[PDB]
Structure formats: structure tokens, C-alpha cells
């Protein structure tokens, strides 16, 4: 509650200062050279190469029964899948639509045969299965299996043979040196093995005697009974069945890269030694290197070039036909995480394999961060430039207002109470030491000069009585609790005089140069020159490691688990038998 | 180092200007109409429907031995799994807990039988396996397998039959038209096939003679020897075993959608034709359309409605019991990426299938971007409003300070040195052309008027001597290196005169109207009116395509790989035999 | 188009106000105590434990042929895999590199034997398969299979036996109580079962008579014919083959945690009860708890401690050898989502199992949000501090300029036209009520005082004629369309008088105290004191649920699908046979 006053001795030319000329503000050259265009992004092809084939085999069952007193007993049953030799196929099924009843094959290196029901061989028609729905079709000749019992006390052996033609779906994966079938049989030969076009250099685990090729082969549709259209056709006689598939060259069917996404409007900027591809429709930003990608380092990449050319030409002709024009041939870049962006640059009218990560967020995060960063940097640059203009403008008010009141402005700028004079075009400042304790300042009642009536004081008079015995100073009350050491502020005595003066924590009121009243500072109504800026801060957040499906849930979508079946079924003999007891 | 001076000819009323009235600032109406409430998010169910069943079968082994000189030789061994007909089950096992020793079945379309050890049929008790741990239990009758040798030189055939009852776990996937068992057998009949409640319209690949239903069937627990509780029970006699499972209706057990996450506090805002669901506890924002979702377009969605009703009612009663109140029935929205949000709106007291993506991460990105965007937009709006108030306030200082010094303020505003006059309520400006070269300005030593002593000049006097022969102008030094063409700035000769004047790069010092000294501008102490704003920019970042597990690592978690086993084991005959040699 | 004037009655001391002292601005203490260091992040090990083993078995085929008239007929063929007893192995193959031609085994609890071709037993050399490429090698003795036909009308039975030694790859998963082989056989014994070191306490589903251990066993390489180096070796005789594998202790080979990523420069800050690990090279932020993690709660975690010690010591010695120094032993924290960060703190020179999520995004998002939040909060703090200094500085201009023009500044601050007086050190304001309608203000032509020539008016004179009959006021035009009710603003008649005054929407021009002309306000040239701030807002974005591979694509990378093979092949008997017809 104690007011602090100062005592400012008269200044001296010692400390002179000046206002700095207006500072220049940096011009922020934020903005890069970009390039609009069209892009097609390609990922690695992880799917298996899928085609359709046919299996031709005969089901040769050999049943041995023991005819008993009142029953028949099967004492053996040997089921076996045997191939159909290509001679019978190309000479009987695709000729008359019939299949011989006699199996001729090779087992244990011997040429063995077998006859259904031990009868004369016939040619039976191939009849569709009862479940021949779409896709999975099969034609067989016999619905019955033959066995005989005999007279009680003897063994009799029967035998069935069932000509079966099934359409299967084959499937081969890189490096395409084998393919498995829906029946479960692995065929250790590439689907592109042949005799011409350098195909004889494919992989094959079989001898060339098992392999037959029919150029111009006209396969037969067993439903419409009509020959199909000519097409080279491979036939391979596996020890347990015969596979046949339409031959197709390797160069035109499989390709390591597949189109992932077409992007109509991209923008390529160049940031510090690296390219950047911003795609605002996907909200995805890929970051490549400045070098081109040579598609000769990747196996089987012949599709992408022409595929992307057709797609990119269509996109340009359908969207940018009139606004822009092309500027050269397509460029190929390897984006980060294993992607391949085929980029066509537009202008306005003015060996290994690639492994792709399984994400797109490392890119969506990149786009979002780039957006916020670019925008916030632009806004900060604008704030900075605007701030400079405002300071350079306020320098004029400060420089133009010093003549009117130099001491107040110099005390504000230096954040310390000082007394300043204008010595022409410069300012001579001087520190005002604060009035210490042991000092009693008494306030006089009247502002009138003694005896004189046309002249009166301007500010209230005070008496700074000293306590250390240094006498008694008699001055008057300056401004902002500044105590001048003289009474040289007089004025012509105005009429209807009313003034308020700041005395510590009070506003003393003087009417006709005499004390009238006093009012606390906290009682006077307030006027604010302050403009408000209530800026709130971003709060801290914590992200939870959320998931839509767990690994268990993702390994729970199939009908059977191979490892489960094997763990449960491979202890059939341990569970239900005693493998440790010996019989003597 | 050369100072540049100007020469300002007297202005003319030609160019008059004025201060613009205060500009209005836009009121930013940033803020949307939101709606708090509770939500439950549902994903597609990708798991298989799992139940428990029992398999009843007999292991019929037929061994053929050749008794030799000093050894016995197995010349054949035919193992086979055969069904247990439902008559024996429902009449002997669930009646006395015993199983007949005689197998009666159908092979090759003939009714065949077989007897263990070729003896009289018995009824053996079903005994638990030695490995009957939790879950996987099995009861069998015989631990031994019977075979006989005979006299050296003859073949003898034995036969075992082992009654086996196993509890398996069945598993069926959409569209639920088959189910596989832990033993490996596919049962081509839906788990919900029956005779009542329209169940006879399910899928079945078998004839109705193989199917038996026992309404009110009381199954028997082979451990506590006690009947279980009544429940309709289906029995199906597959050619190789008999499956039995408790029947359950399709409408009450399987449902395409499963609850993923309950969210207690959500907020639905409406942004440009689309809904948005902000969930601050998950930090996830889903973006749907304005339309409701009809759950009748999705197969098997009967669970979600009532399930969500119970959960949502519990959540309200446990958290928002007193603060808010409900405002109508639940609404169903299809969020983006394939999710289903069942949203219950609160208020304060004042056919196909759905395919779900495997990542809500695009939604965590959405939430984070929405947060930064909303907050930064709010802060920019506040900066803009505050900026307007500050400019509208500084307009008062500029307008109020022009009378004191019009030329300085007009030179600052126009960013060009000009001379302005106040022609009443307007300002008449005039350009000040800069003083060119070939001009020598000489500085006079004394500021005193010749002869006069009570009158002296205010600013130093200069002599602008010309070189093109245009004579010699004699004026004095104005302010800011302005060269007035006259000497009309006089003053009453003050006592103790001290002034500093700016002469190019120097402050010339004059004491009693005579030159005294000079000081370089770079030597005078400085006072700064500048407030600092050191704003730093966001730097560029590069995100690496990081992963926790690769695709290989994710295909390395199982005990066996089916394709690996098949590639290695299906060349057993090629590796270890010579399939190309013929014997003659 | 109508100008609005005011009428301000003379103020009264009633409403006095004052400028607020400068407001203090909060010092933003944004900044946390961080700790630099090195970290190694460890994920859960999901891969199977993979080792190499050898299988020793004999292929015993038993063929029964029926020699016919002009052909041979196989009436049975029983293939079987039989073990090689360990006596023959350790006494003949690893001694001489030969294998006996006689199989001795146990089937149906009887000790059975069999001889290839029914000949005298021999010792045949083990010969490599023709396909012995890298890795998968196999040595067998016979490429041929023996069978005989006989005289037409009789059955003859042959038999092959083929000694086969294959190198397989075994594979066991947690809790390591079984392992499967590449041949498909499950071995129900832990790979770490033994006789010493407490290994006899592992899991084993077999009797101890089937198990043999050879301490110091020197296995034999069948290619270089040389003994290998000594190593304890387990042998187990499974009912269908014999497995042999080098024994290795459980404590030194398998460990639940695997090193995921080494991070050279991390920074651990402490935010609200939780630790945070910022890794700027990965752009990843993990958020743990303040507690240490006890690695004794996790099974098989013995690797991580010493592994991380070696790696962390190497990292320090290679990068931070001279800049920093260590500050204690390593600390172990469980980050969120199931990760384990082993953190070594640096200083400058001044039981269950852990389940890991499959993401590295919930943390890349965390890092990015932390970066934007920290930077934007720092910038907002700087804007706020700068704003305070600027307001505290502008308070000096407002306080210092009130003496010059109190009414204009008080009208601007209060955003309302008022009339203010300076009553010493305070300001007494008074509201100026606006001049209503029914009032005609007439403008006089001359500014000259009647008769007097050395004295003239300063502002144009007006006559406010009243219409309600209240007479006619005669005053003059004040400033800013303020209508003073008196004519007390006179001036010494200057020469060359030129003034512009604002009359509504016009600037009336007066030359020598007489009306001259008028100009519309919209016609006067403009000067702007306004500094521009064009701040643009962030626009709304929508993220699409993008994916690189779908779930189908990820389940399409294998050669065969087990469930597909089983669904297609398990209806072989239903498709191609008639299981519903009975023969009588
Ligand atoms: C061994 O026995 C089986 C039967 O156990 C024999 O199968 C028969 O042969 C038919 C020809 O292959 C086969 O397909 C037939 O039916 C197909 C389905 O069409 C429906 O409408 C039929 C009435 O016209 C109806 O009988 C039939 O119902 C049977 O099939 C359904 C299918 O799920 C079962 O649910 C039933 O239980 C029942 O078994 C169907 O509802 C039909 O598409 C077939 O037509 C073929 O040919 C057409 C040319 O005209 C062509 O246009 C069409 O696309 C098809 O390719 C065909 O009519 C049946 O399964 C069965 N036939 C009968 C009398 O039901 C099998 O042939 C035999 N094998 C040998 C070698 O002997
Ligand atoms: C063919 O031969 C096999 C043996 O080769 C027969 O199996 C026997 O029959 C028992 C009943 O099915 C079967 O289970 C028994 O043991 C179970 C384990 O309990 C433990 O504690 C026992 C102490 O009393 C101990 O002997 C036993 O150790 C045996 O089993 C473990 C299993 O890992 C082996 O590791 C050992 O080598 C040893 O063989 C166990 O440690 C036990 O749970 C069973 O109790 C059942 O019934 C209880 C009712 O009272 C019930 O409460 C409980 O829940 C169980 O359901 C039971 O005691 C054994 O494998 C074996 N018995 C013996 C004497 O070892 C098989 O029956 C036979 N098949 C036929 C048809 O002939
Ligand atoms: C049952 O019959 C099969 C044949 O049907 C017998 O297999 C023979 O035995 C050889 C030894 O195991 C086996 O491997 C031999 O060839 C390997 C490949 O090397 C190549 O270069 C050879 C030039 O000399 C060339 O002949 C050979 O071409 C054959 O094999 C390739 C393999 O794909 C086929 O594509 C061809 O069609 C052709 O069949 C190869 O191109 C070779 O690595 C082997 O050397 C081993 O031993 C070396 C020690 O000196 C060692 O350095 C090396 O690392 C190998 O371990 C070996 O020469 C062949 O498959 C075959 N031999 C012949 C004559 O082709 C099998 O032995 C028999 N089983 C029994 C028990 O009777
Ligand atoms: C700023 O705004 C927030 C939001 O309502 C408010 O809580 C806070 O009190 C405000 N601060 C000031 C100083 O007005
Ligand atoms: C702004 O702050 C940064 C951070 O320390 C500093 O490097 C830079 O020099 C500062 N700029 C100015 C102009 O002070
Ligand atoms: C602000 O800048 C944007 C960007 O070009 C522009 O469209 C807009 O008109 C500007 N606003 C103002 C008021 O100048």
C-alpha cells in the first residue's frame, strides 16, 4: 500500500540515444517449382497365375471279397487313379465322344492292364456327373462298382474302371517351375513348356517321352458335342493321371507388376535431391529419387509399359484434351515402399524383383503432414511480413510523438523510469533514482501563489521533509508520482478550475486551487486501450493401438486348418492302439 | 557513404488525399451444429461358425500275413473307417453304454459285414483313451489289433474292429452349405438342416434316407453315465462315419455382423451433405452419408438390432442416467470402409453382404486432421479479429497525429518522401524530387543572425552551390536530410543551447550556435522501438515405410504349410523310383 | 445518403475514467525435462523354431499280381513306410556307409520282417537321388521295384524295400511340445527332450524305450564319407520312420522376444504420469508407463538382456564415444501395443506372454501429432508474448496523446461518439446524443466576421433551424460532423487561405473565407493506414479407406489351398459313384 516516488536529478548530455531506422523484413520465397501430370501406380503381383486345365484319368478299384455263411466280407480294397494314354484321348474321345473300358498303364516298370468286370472291352459314352453345376464339371461312364461274392468259403476279386474327365483350375507361382491342380497333384513342369519359340528351355522334371504337343489341336466340348477352335495344346502323362492345358507363351500372360490405381491429377515437386508425387484425390504423397527406373532390372515386366501407355492416353484424351498438352514420353519412378509410378508430364497451354510393403498410411501420413506443414508455413510467413509492416509503421508514430512528450516515451521504451530531453535531432536520457524511505512528503492545501491572484500553480505543492537532518525540500507533485525539486510550473488562473491529481493510490480533487476531496484508484471507472487475444493451446493426445481384426481372427476365415487336422488325426494310432505291447 | 538529400518544391492543392474510415472486419461464424450420443460400431463377421459334434465310427483293419520259416510277413493291410448305424447308437450306446463288436455297412452297393477276430459278436464297454485331456476326448473298446500267422507256407487273414466315439469341433462358413470337422471330413449338409420351422429348405447333398432326426433326444455322457438334457439332435450317416450334432435354428445362432467397439461419448456433426462421427475416446472419426441404412439389405443381420438395443440401454443407464435424456429410436448408419454405426441420439436437459477394410487408421488420420484443422482455423479466426480491432484502433492515432506532423506521417504511409499540408479536414500531398549530383552543400559554422543577438536560427544554415552555373542557393538544413530553400526558421536565443543535427552520416554538435564537434551515426547509442517476433518454420519430414511383421513372417506362424508338404512329398515316386525304365 | 449529426451538451464531472496500468503477460513455461539415450525395440517372436533333422526309413511295397492270358494284372499294391532301427543306423550306415536289405519292425504288436525280392539280405550302398539339389538331399539304394507275374492263372506277390535317408527341416511352435517335419509327420516330443540338465522334464507322448540318446555322437556325411564333429544326438523311432536330430538346450536357442529395430538417438520425456519415447529417425513415438518392466513375468526371455547389452554397447562405442557418457544400467519398459524398449540413458559431458499389435502407425500418428502440437504451441506462445509487448507499448502512445485530442481518442476507445475533457490526471467523459430528424441545417457562405477584417471564423457557420417551433440555433460546423452550439472558434485572418471541410458526403472548399466548390467523398483520392493480413483457412478433407492388398489377395499367394482341395476332392465318391443303390 505504499506509493513509491522517484527523484530525478537534471540530466546530462552523457547518455544520448536515437530511434533505429526501419528494419527490413525478409521476403519469404516460399513456393516450389511443381509439374502437373497423370500417373498410374503399380504394385507387385502377389497372386498366383491361374488358368484352366483338364485331367483325364480312370478310377481302377480292385475289391477282394470273402463269401461267408450268411454274409459277404471285403478282405481288401485297392483304389487307384491311373492315366488315360493320349492315344485313346486324341483317337476316341475327341473323335466319337466315347471312352474305352480297358486300362493300359505302367506300374512297377511293367506294362499292366485291367478290365472292368473282367469282360470284353467296350466304348462307353461319357456322361456328366449329377453335380455338374457351373465351373466344376466332370464326365464319367459308370455309377456302379462291380464285386462278386462266390460260393461260401472262397475269395473272389472284382474290379471297376471308371473313365473320368474333369475340368480343373491350375495355379502356378513364381518362378513358375511347377503348378498344382485342384485335385492336389503337383505337375513338375512349367505351364509354358513347349517346343517352339524357345519354350523348350523352360523347366521340366519329366522325360520328353511323357510330353506330347498337338499344334492346331481342336479340343472337344463334351456337352455340345462340337469341336472347339484350334489352339496349341500340351498333354502330359503323369504317373497317376493325364493333364492337358492350352499352351500360352510366357511373355504375354504373366507380368510381375499389376496396376494398383490410376490417378488423373498429380503434381510432382522437387524437394532436396528427391522427387515428390502429391495426389490430392487419394490424399497420398509418394517420395521417390531423382533417377529414372530402368524396368529391365525386373523380371517379367513387359506388361506395364504398354498397359500404362494405353491407360494414360485414354485418361488424357478423356479429361485434359483441351486444357493441357503432353511434354514427352512417359517416365518411370520407383516410389518408396516398393511402388512403381509411371508418370506422364503435362504442361499448360501457356535382375531382381520388387517387394511392396503392405501399407498406404506411411504415404497418407506424408500427405497430411505436407499439407499442414505447407499451410502453416504460409500463414507464419504472412504473419511475419504483416508484423514487419506494422512495426515499420509504428516507428513513425514513435518518432513523430517524441517532441510532444519525450520523457514518457523514453520511460516506456527502456522499460524503466527515465528523464529524456530532445537535444535537437537526438535524445539525451538520464536515469531517475527512486526516492528511498525515511522521507515524509506532506501535501499542501492550496494551489494559489501567496498574495498573487492572477497567477497560480499548475500542480499540487509538496514538502519533502527529511529525517537524516538534510533539511526540508519544498517542491510540487509532477506526473506519474514524479517529485520535481522545484515549483516552476505556474499558470494563468483559469475560471471554473477542476482537476484530479494522482497521489499514490488516490485521486485528490481540487476545486478553485484548494483541496476538496479524494478518491481511491480502485473506485474510478475504467477505460481499456487493450485489445484482447485469447489464444488457446493444443492439448496432448494419446492414441490407442486400435485394430479391426486380430491375427487370430485373420487365421480363422478358412474351412479347415491343415496343422489342426494333422495334430488331431496323426495320433489316431497312438490314441486308439497300444504300440508298446509285444505278443509272444 | 554518400548522403542523399531531397529538394521539395512548394506543394499544390492538386493531389489531396484522406484517411479511410475504419474497415469492418468479418465475423467468423466458425462452429457447427453437433449432436452428442452413444454409438456401437459393428464390423463384418469373418470367423467361421463353430460348434461341437460327435463322430461315431468303427476302425476295421484287415491284415493278411504270410507265415514263413522263421518269421511272419504282412502281405497286405487294409485299414478302413466305417460308420456306426444309428440303430446301434440309439439302442445300445445311449441305453447301456456298450457297443457291438459286429460292423454292418454298405460297400460297393452291397451290404457287407465284418467281425473282430472272426468270433461271436459281443458288446464291449466304451473305454476312454489314455490321452483324454480337456476338450479332445475319445472312447474306444480295443487297444489291440488281431492277426494270426499260421503254419509256415500259408496266408492267414485277421481283422480288427474298434468302436470309436470322438467329440470333434465342427466349423462352417458362409453361405453355410457344408461343414468340415477336425477329423478332416466334409459333411455336405448345412448345420441347420432339419424337418420343422422351414429347415427342410436348407442345403443337402445327401438323400433323405441317410438323415435321422430325434426330437427330444437325450444324449448320454459316457463319463458320468447319466443322460443329458433333452435337445433336438440330427444324425447323418456319411459313407465313412456317422456325425451327430445338436440342431439349432439358423436365425438365432449366426449373424453377419459382430460388435467391434462400444463408444460411450460420440458427437455427430453434419458437414456438406454427409454425417461425421467424432469419437474422442478412440481418437477416431467416421464419415457416413445422410441417409439411414436399411438392415434388410444384408443377409443374417437379425442379431445386431436387439444386441445393440440391450448394450445401448445399459450404457445410458450406467453413465448418462441423470445428465441427458434420449430423443427417439436408434438410427443405423453405414460408415466409410464398411462399418455399421448404431447411433442413439441424446439431448441435454436444456441382398448383399458388407465387406470391411482391415484398417480404421484412415479414420485415426481423419480424427487427427480434423482436430488440427478445427483448432488452427479457430486460432486464425481469432488472430484475424484481433488484427482488425488493432488496425481500427491505430487509425485513431494516425488521424489524431496528422495535425502535429503531417509531412512525416504522409511520407511513412506512402513509403516515399513527400511533403503534405493540412487544408482543413483533408491533406494535400506533393512529391519531393531527390537532390541530384553535381551539387556541393557547404555547412556554415554559426547559427547566429548577423548583428542580431536576441534572434538566432533554429536549424544549421547551408549553401547549395551549383555547378551547371545556375548560381548558388543559400538555405538551411531541414529534417531527415531535407534541404529547405529558405532560412525562415528563427528562434528566441535560448540560454545554455545544446543541439545535435543529422548531417548525412554524422551528428554535428552545436553549442551556443557555433560548431563544436561531430559524431558518426554508428557511434551513437541505440534505443529500439521494435518488438521482436522470431517465428520459426516447420521443417520437412520423410516417413519411412515401417512394418512390424512382413508377409513372410505372417505366413510363418503355423506348424505345417500345406503347399510345402505337397511339393516335397509328391515327388517321392520321382525321386526314389525310375518311372522311365521298361522291363521286357 | 443522409448524414447523421450529433449534439453534444457540455460534459459534467459525473463520468470520469482512466487508462489501465500495463497488464502483465504470462510467461509461458513450455518445455519439458527430457533425457537422450539409445534404445532397442523388441517385438514378440511369431516365427516357428526351425532346425534340421534327418529321417531314416525303408519303403516297403508289397505288390500282388495276377498273371493272365496276354497280360499281367496288379490285384493289390500295399505301400508302407517303415522305420530303420537305431542298431542298424549306428552300426552299419555310420560305420561303413551301407544299409541292410532286410526290414525288421513291429506291426499289429508282432515282430514282422520283410526281404526285398525274397532274396538273401545284403548291404547296399546308399546312393544320392537324381534331384539332389541344394538343401533337400536324399540317399536311396534301389531305383527299381520288383514284381513277378508267373504262369497264367496264378497270383504272385513281390516286394521292394528301399533304404531312404532324407535331410528334412523340422519346425516347432510355442509351447514347443511337438514338432512337424517337411514329410508331414508330427513327432509328439519336444525338440529339447533329453536325459541331462533337467531335460528329462520336457514333454513326450512316447515311452522311454523308443528314445535313444548318443552323447558324443559323430554323425556321418554320406557325401564326403567322413565323420562330422561330435555332438549329442537324439534318435526317436516313430512307428512309421526314425527321426534323428542334434540336441540343443531350450535356454540357449528359443526366446520369446526378437530384436525389431535399433534406434541410435531417442529422447525420453515424462508427460503426466507416463513416459514417452520420441525417435526422430523412425518418426515414431512410443508411450509407456513410469514403471520398469520385470522380464521375469515373460516365458523364455533370456536372450533379450544380453543381446541388447552387446548391441547397445556397440552403438555407444561407435557413435557417442566422445560426446556423452552412460548413467547407469539399462532400463526395460513395455511400450504401448505390446512392445519392449530396452533404453540406455546417456548424459552430456556437462507368467504370461506379450502380444504385439501388427501396426507401426498408431505411433507414427503419435509422433506427427506431437510434432505439430509442440511446434504450433510454441508459435502461439510467441505470438501471445509479442502481442503483450505491443499492447504495453501502444499504451504509452494512447496515454501520451490524450492531451492533444481527448475527444477523438475517447470516442475511438469507447466505440461510441463521446466528448471528453482532461480534468488534470483523469478524463471526464460525457455521451453525445445524436441529432434527430425534423432539423434543417443551413450552411452559410462566408467565414468572415461581420465588419471585422483581421478576425475570421475557423470553421464554417451553420444555422440549425428547428421545426417543432423551438426557435433557431446558430452555430458552426465542428469536426467529424459534430455540431457545436456556439461560434467561439475564431482565428487571425491568414493570407492565402485554403481549407476543405467535411459536410456529410461532401468536402466543401473555401477560398478566402467564402464558398468556392464542393466535391463528393467518393471522388477524393485515398491514402490507407491499413496493414493487410489475408489469412486463409484450412479446408476440410476426406480420407478414403485405401488398401494395397485385400484379404483375398493375401490368401492367394500360396500354391494350394487346403480347404479348396478338400472340398473338391472329398466328393469324389459322391460325384462318381451311386451310394444310394442297393444290389440284391
Ligand atoms: C450317375 O447318376 C447320376 C444321378 O445320381 C446321374 O445324374 C443325372 O444326369 C443328369 C445329366 O448329367 C444330371 O444333370 C441333370 O439335371 C441338371 C439340373 O437341372 C435340374 O432340373 C432337372 C429336371 O429337368 C432335375 O431332374 C434336376 O434335379 C437333379 O439335380 C439337382 C441338382 O442339384 C439335384 O438337386 C437333384 O437331387 C437331382 O439329382 C435339376 O434340379 C441339369 O442341369 C442337367 O442338364 C444338363 O444338360 C442340359 C442339356 O439339355 C444342359 O442345358 C444343362 O446345362 C446341363 O448340362 C441334367 O438334366 C442329373 O444330376 C441326373 N439326372 C436326373 C434324371 O436327375 C449321372 O448322369 C450318372 N452318371 C453316369 C455316367 O451314369
Ligand atoms: C488303452 O490303454 C490305455 C493306456 O495305454 C488306457 O488308458 C488308461 O485308462 C485311463 C482312463 O481312461 C486313462 O486316464 C487315466 O489317467 C488320467 C490322468 O490322471 C493322472 O493321474 C493318475 C493317477 O491316478 C496317473 O496314473 C495318470 O498317469 C497316466 O496318464 C498320464 C496322462 O498324461 C500319462 O502321462 C502317464 O504315463 C499315465 O499313463 C495321470 O497322470 C485320468 O484323468 C483318468 O481319470 C478319468 O476318469 C476320472 C473318473 O474317476 C475323471 O475324474 C477324470 O477326469 C478322467 O476322465 C484316468 O485315471 C489313462 O491313460 C490310463 N490309465 C492308467 C491306469 O494309466 C485306455 O483306457 C485303454 N483303452 C481301452 C479301451 O482299453
Ligand atoms: C537312380 O537313378 C538316378 C537317375 O535317374 C540316379 O541319379 C544319378 O546319380 C547322380 C549322383 O547322385 C545324380 O547327380 C549327378 O548329377 C548332378 C548334376 O550335375 C550336373 O552335371 C552333370 C555333368 O557330369 C550332368 O550329367 C547332370 O545332368 C543330369 O542331372 C541333371 C540334374 O537336374 C538333370 O537335369 C539332367 O537331365 C541329367 O540327369 C547335371 O547337369 C551332380 O551334382 C551330381 O554330383 C554329385 O556328387 C559330386 C561329387 O563329385 C558333388 O560334387 C556334387 O555336389 C553332387 O553331390 C551327380 O553327378 C544324377 O541325377 C544321376 N547321374 C547321372 C549319370 O546323370 C540315382 O543315383 C539312382 N539311384 C540309385 C540309388 O540307384
Ligand atoms: C479463452 O477462451 C477459453 C475458452 O472458453 C476460456 O476458457 C478462457 O477463460 C479464455 N481466456 C480468457 C483470458 O478470456
Ligand atoms: C529464432 O530462434 C531460433 C531458435 O533458437 C534461432 O536459431 C534463431 O537465430 C532466432 N532468430 C532470431 C532472428 O533471433
Ligand atoms: C487472400 O488470398 C487468396 C489466395 O489467392 C485470395 O483468393 C483472396 O482473394 C485473398 N483475400 C484478400 C482479402 O485479399
Numbering used by the authors:
A (entry chain B), B (entry chain A), C (entry chain C): 115 to 464, 503 to 736
From the paper:
A cooperative assembly of glycoproteins composed of the trimeric gB and the heterodimer gH-gL constitutes the core herpesvirus fusion complex. Due to structural similarities with viral fusogens of vesicular stomatitis virus (VSV) G protein and baculovirus gp64, gB has been designated a type III fusogen. As for other herpesviruses, VZV employs gB and gH-gL for virion entry fusion. Unlike the closely related herpes simplex virus (HSV) gB orthologues, the mature glycosylated form of VZV gB (~130kDa) is cleaved into two fragments (~69kDa and ~73kDa) at the 491RSRR494 furin recognition site.
